[PDB]
Design a protein around this ligand. Sequence first.
Ligand SMILES: *[C@@H]1O[C@H](CO)[C@@H](O[C@@H]2O[C@H](CO)[C@@H](O)[C@H](O)[C@H]2NC(C)=O)[C@H](O)[C@H]1NC(C)=O
Ligand SMILES: [Ca+2]
Ligand SMILES: [Ca+2]
Ligand SMILES: [Cl-]
Lengths: 5, 274
Amino acid sequence: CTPSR
Amino acid sequence: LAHSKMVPIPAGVFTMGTDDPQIKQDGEAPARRVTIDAFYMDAYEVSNTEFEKFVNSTGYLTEAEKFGDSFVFEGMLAAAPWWLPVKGANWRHPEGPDSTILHRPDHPVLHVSWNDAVAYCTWAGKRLPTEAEWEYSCRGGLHNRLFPWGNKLQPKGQHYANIWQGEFPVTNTGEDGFQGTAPVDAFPPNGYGLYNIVGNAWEWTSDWWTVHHSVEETLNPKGPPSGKDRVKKGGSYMSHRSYCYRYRCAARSQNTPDSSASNLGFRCAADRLP
Ligand SMILES: *[C@@H]1O[C@H](CO)[C@@H](O[C@@H]2O[C@H](CO)[C@@H](O)[C@H](O)[C@H]2NC(C)=O)[C@H](O)[C@H]1NC(C)=O
Ligand SMILES: [Ca+2]
Ligand SMILES: [Ca+2]
Ligand SMILES: [Cl-]
């Protein structure tokens, strides 16, 4: 749902 | 506008997680009884205007500004093809250098990392909520329901949160009134007075991430003492039943603390009023 940096 | 207002979350015991997990890999199970002392929770996600007051006061440069990029969803110009690291995307420029927040001062702040969120909340005399505090608050005084308001997505035919409608990622119909974010005071409050606790922006919590939970009863749990990713909750304007069914209080996901994206923000909590 959100990629990690 | 009182977009830094807090509401009192009452002392209580609740069932965290679920014995009917919908995303088993995320450790939604097992259901466990957790006791939470009375505390205060921000009614709203932190808005652009409120974050700007923090930056004005402190001069704080967010991690995304320092790194020089942040993740943006393709459909509004990685972990998926629809996530692009965009140079110059940050809280003031949510889709990149030629985007602005001037027309959306009351929308949740985005492209804020866990560290950014902790800096803001502490500046404000507050802190991040624990996952358990967050989930308790999300549930809004109801037991074992999917959503803050109950088990129906559109109760009485009304939209109650800003998520995705249509075929993700190709088409967002904007049926609920918002393609991207909505103002932090949009949609009905839950039983405790909280707005957009599911949907709109994902929300950081203080806990390190694990998927291994005991069934044991706990008091004011803080999560595991170590980890590599911090827990985020609640889903976002991108969430949909078909791919990221995480606009449920029991849902949970994670990112490394230096992560930032165009669908991730936060709200603060406090033991007492600041
Ligand atoms: C953050 O600080 C900026 C810069 O001071 C504020 O914008 C200015 O506010 C003054 C005082 O009202 C206005 O007269 C200027 O026209 C503004 N200048 C700019 C650059 O826009 C801004 O209001 C502050 N933001 C918040 C949320 O408090
Ligand atoms: Ca929407
Ligand atoms: Ca939210
Ligand atoms: Cl999402």
